[PDB]
Swiss-Prot record, chains A, B, C, D, E, F:
The keyword Metal-binding applies. Signal peptide: none annotated. GO terms for biological process: alcohol biosynthetic process; isoprenoid biosynthetic process; mycotoxin biosynthetic process. This is Copalyl diphosphate synthase. The gene is PvCPS. The lineage of its organism: Eukaryota, Fungi, Dikarya, Ascomycota, Pezizomycotina.
Length: 304, 304, 304, 304, 304, 304
């Protein structure tokens, strides 16, 4: 035969994972692993299966970061260069897409037929989330706050619900944790939306107000645009995707003038009270007190 | 409750599949359908199953085109604009990645315990193929022809093999058709590589010598670079990613001087001969005479 | 005294009108002269006054072309280079703005107390028209056809009305010709919108489908976008401001599929019919039969 | 009728004035209003008419800023983003051009036929000034100092003389203040020319030496170029329109080496002595002592 | 010892002369060989020496083409891609500069004490010529025709004179042929300047009117700019360095209106007449009738 | 005669030397002049000839800086703008190429036939050095450390050896100093390679890690790339030519992780010990003790 097929070699797998391994080497906050641990106080998935779920979620998380940074044309991730500024958008996009299916091969180790439908439903929902966010961005059409939370429940909540739904599939308890964890993702994203524009530590890790450079209809941005349609300064700044900080400082100033950050803080307050009440609900009906998930809720809301 | 979850709507699916429907609306060759059809003369998959496999292969094929045209920074697809030059790269990339998982969902309709692993194995090989091709392109490091074929087996063969491996999994005979189909994919790809540089039908559909613009180390380009490594004009032309026709016709002329199109024709002759031997071996061992796969063979190499 | 004021010199006026004289040297259709001439069959303005109004309308028309080609980022004007591609945007913009006021000075030669307010009212409407068109373009927000016509009445009708309103102000009859002329301007503009996409005479003078390159929401483009709002290819093509012909011919093809050129032809038929009714009504009430305005009518819609 | 014309709505006027209202909200020094107040000590125009003149001058001033920033491709105005970096050059240019004629409609409220000829003569002169400055810039031809002051007397003095000439038209005193106010504009512009390169507060408000980035043949720049034609470093730096501060710091260093800033300071001294002597001249012949205009002269000359 | 010095290898010379060999592989006119050949009818240089001078002139000529195409930012050379569009500017520039000194080494093979000073004097004049041409281009300051000719004598004559001055130095007769050859170089250059704007053979080899794209003040361009300095379109077109054909054909049309190609034809007629007089004077004083130099004369002006 | 040749004027020589005179006015470290003085303790070349050698070496040094900065697309030189950011790449390249031959005319003043062959051999070697460095850079092929030192001995050592070899030609002593001075250039370049990435004073003079922006396979960069081929982060950062400091700080961090700076320091140690032993060798055999060259060796190695 003229063609003799060769085995896949570690050296080649080291190329394919180049961009992905670069990100995993950048130190991150590891909040999804602490989310899983919190919920395991209740679901008590054994260590063998839990370690597989933690691998799958951490894998997909990094893969999405590779691809969001490309799609969102970001400069910094975790204070350091975005992977594609080193490896180029093409290899980084491929490396992330590759990992998606490496994680699918991992979920398969659970030998749990429900876990597969869960992964497929989840990846469908994640892509539906980024699909709507990109739609609004590129059409310069500000969504309603309700539309935004639907999108976030798919895009950010979608990974949280995968993690917990895989755990539910690996446990016999018949209690539905998904509503709680979806709420936690929404809070997490709204908090992330606020910190992008207000935290000094987020300026260090992504740059000043990078959501403005990216053109994102984020939560406080939506509220400031919609609080006065007569003024089109902010939505036009979004259209310009400004890299300059003079424009970003002006936008962040305009957004304070529309009380958009008290608004967001107040919404996060109301959602935290729902989450605490949901948690207390689960515990009234058979579940032991869960300090860890109360701390994960406190940690994500400190409005730095 | 502040957040109430909404259903996914037909209008939103229409947005998410915007770029995908655009490509599907472009008249194509539907070549993998004619290949499945000709293998079904042997495998005789039930029609409901063949219809599901045909949808899966159709979706994935269009989806990769979205992603591949982005990574290659192509301009034309099937003589029309590439999807991201209409919808933008981000929405094109998400549309393609989305469809990867809509197809995984469609594979589930077969209800075959082995289908998920077949899908995973193929998507992994697909990304392994494209991963290595990007690696060589981005590093300006010319592969050997042996390495090229290994990569092609994964990249172009990877989806051919997914089709025949799903069919095998739904058939009642046990014959292994994979080495044949992977040979058919290598031939298909080498022919594509030649036509991209030498066919008017391709200069009209993707533009004149578009593998040069995209910097690709394709089969004739590899041969021409390696046949006189003291002359470095062709590899340097690749690095310049030329959109200008004058540079591309000079490269094309250099490639006739190194006699690389005759080389490629000869290799295709040798590979088609192995394919016919393989087909004839399968037929001497039981299976019935397959005219259709001989026509597919003779159609894909027609201009060679 | 250190500073001594110098006079303005012929050499400096030549510099200031550099871009303006350039456009005027380009052979044009001189269409507004043929429209003034045909309304003068009724208004019978004295020749000295008509000569001043004709210079005023000529200057303003060329001046707006300078400014409009800059705001549209056009390439060709009357088949030749646009003025700023020779003189630069800044000098083209100043030349045009200058001429606005040289024309205001020429209007003063009429010595008519009401002429200044007519000029002001027209320049204001002109900028109101262009203001709204830029607003819709820059915001990627498709107007309704009713909104388009209102805008066109101001933008294209605004200078037609200035001509006829200055003439009325110098005539001795009291008939109001404005609603007719503004209808004539809306027709002129809709015809321009159609020809820009469908005429070889325009593809040679401004380039193929140049309203697409400039992102304009023109009459047929509005109809095509709104007639199937689930398909978003055409509006997305506008956002990309494509200079490539392949994208433009795809858009042009989509626009034939939504049947938007037949729609535009029908609307022009309806509007020409109103115009003839209006003309005939003016004639039944006293004024003499005006063949010339019927020829202007039939000339501007000729290719429709 | 198929077309029914709509009234202009406040919402639409809020769009047209978008860029203009943005500038008027940025806090400025308001030196033209204090110029008018100073001169009213003498002309005693009543409050009803004066308020109209102050509106017209402040309107035109902002409109010119919109357009100069576009023409001069500036980044900052009054320490904040230039309007067109938010609204785009097109809407900003239109909004400014629009305001030109809004101000003409305002001058009309004076019901003073002389005021109209004054406005027309003034707008002619302003455009003649920017016409010559742009001519020299784009031709990389350094003017003489005398040519520069002729240009400035039109460009900067032109607005000062409009303001005072409108006041003279609204007052019965037969004393010609224009020579004095033209001198004041020249001083103002030379001072502005120096502060652009030397003031720390101007670096905060426009950036470091932004006249260099813009390529302006400003007063000290002219003198430094002409003080040694053998060296072409400075005029070549002008050609490069440098955004980098390394180049601007070098240019400002070279310009100190040619004693160009003592030269400019010395010229401002001589012009202030002329202005004070002119003011004393007006007062010897009937006019009361005018402290305010002495302070406006002191405020503009403090060589920060 | 840590460092051990290696020899220079054939493979490394191949790399260094990569761009130079590329140009030499492009079919050219070999015009300076036909000029040397025709002067050798008189000077009768021994063949070994003439072969060395011919190699020196060949190398320098190709080398300057490398450097000149870089400084002019040209696209096509002899109908093919310019060397730096294949190898990059840096390697093209180094290749050319390298060859300058490989040619100095070849000049040494003549073993003539006066040859080094001849080479130096020519390279110096060559760079003096190109230096002044860049100065006028970069400063947008049109030279006088007298200045142009002085520059051309150095730039184009400079290498003609190097050839004839090396030959004179190896011959046994004492006749001075330099003023003749420098006249021949001025004629050659003026003809090149005309053909670049008017010949189909040149529009195919360098592109349509490429001196406009490169902003050159060439002989007809100088005449057209200076013949009506009130019209500034042509000089402004130079500043824009237009790659667009529409701008270039407008310039070409303006240049026919100023009657600058007839002027250039007339000047070439006058200069060819002086050349024939000079040739005939050399022949009446001893030298034999030189048909070949009359053919070179009549060939270079053929299209004029 | 129609053409009358003009003399070269000081004003024109001042244009040609524009970029070169700009550099010579920027204050530099003057290490080559102190190298020549050190070696003259031994060679005792008289002041008349030495002053010529110092002129030639300082001339060529500046000329190469003009051209390297262009080739390497640098921003700063000696803390100030690169000459071509003021004069443009074309005039700067010409001015440097011009000076090459001005220096050749200077070497001629030595009336030393050996000096000419020395200059030619040296300019050949310099261009061979930059030829190989550019080859590796543009091909993204990391050379071996041995290949790098061969290149540096030509590129940096080539000017050092010219200086000393011209002195040897002007002196009767028959002792070969070239091996020592070539070693000194290698040390100098390795030191320069390290200081580019580590010195605070080099960040001030060229910018942070400018070798990374330029894509140079410098000494520590080579060692870090080759110390782990599995990781391709650093060589890919080289390919991207990063202007951003986030990427450069990451690269410099990665390079510390591979102990590349201890490696380079250790190599410089071993080379200094060879140089000191070489110097002691020359002194054992007749040469007087040479403190100056011991200090030039100490000054270049202080690893700031």
């Amino acid at each position: 035969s003229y063609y003799q097929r060769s085995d896949w070699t570690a050296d080649e797998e080291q190329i394919l994972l180049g961009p992905f391994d670069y990100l995993e080497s950048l130190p991150g906050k590891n909040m999804r692993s602490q989310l899983i641990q919190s919920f395991n106080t209740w679901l008590k998935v054994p260590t063998e299966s839990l370690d597989v779920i933690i691998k799958v979620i951490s894998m997909l998380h990094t893969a999405f970061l590779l691809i969001d940074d490309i799609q969102d044309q970001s400069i910094l991730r975790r204070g350091q260069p975005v992977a594609h500024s080193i490896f180029g958008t093409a290899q980084a996009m491929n490396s992330g897409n590759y990992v998606y299916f490496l994680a699918l091969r991992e979920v398969q180790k659970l030998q749990n037929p429900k876990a597969i439908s869960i992964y497929v439903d989840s990846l469908i929902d994640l892509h539906r989330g980024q699909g709507m966010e990109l739609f609004w961005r590129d059409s310069l059409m500000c969504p309603t706050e309700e539309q935004y939370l639907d999108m976030v429940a798919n895009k950010t909540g979608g990974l949280f619900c995968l993690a917990i739904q895989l755990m539910q599939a690996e446990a016999t308890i018949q209690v539905d944790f998904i509503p709680l964890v979806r709420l936690l993702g929404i809070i997490f994203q709204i908090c992330d939306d606020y910190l992008n524009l207000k935290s000094t530590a987020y300026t260090d890790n992504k740059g000043l107000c990078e959501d403005l450079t990216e053109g994102k209809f984020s939560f406080p941005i939506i509220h400031s645009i919609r609080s006065n349609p007569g003024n089109r300064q902010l939505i036009n700044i979004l259209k310009q995707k400004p890299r300059e900080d003079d424009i970003k400082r002006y936008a962040l100033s305009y957004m304070e003038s529309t009380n958009s950050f008290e608004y967001t803080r107040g919404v996060v307050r109301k959602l935290k009270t729902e989450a605490i009440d949901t948690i207390q609900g689960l515990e009234k009906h058979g579940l032991e007190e869960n300090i860890g998930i109360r701390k994960i809720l406190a940690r994500m809301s400190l409005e730095l």
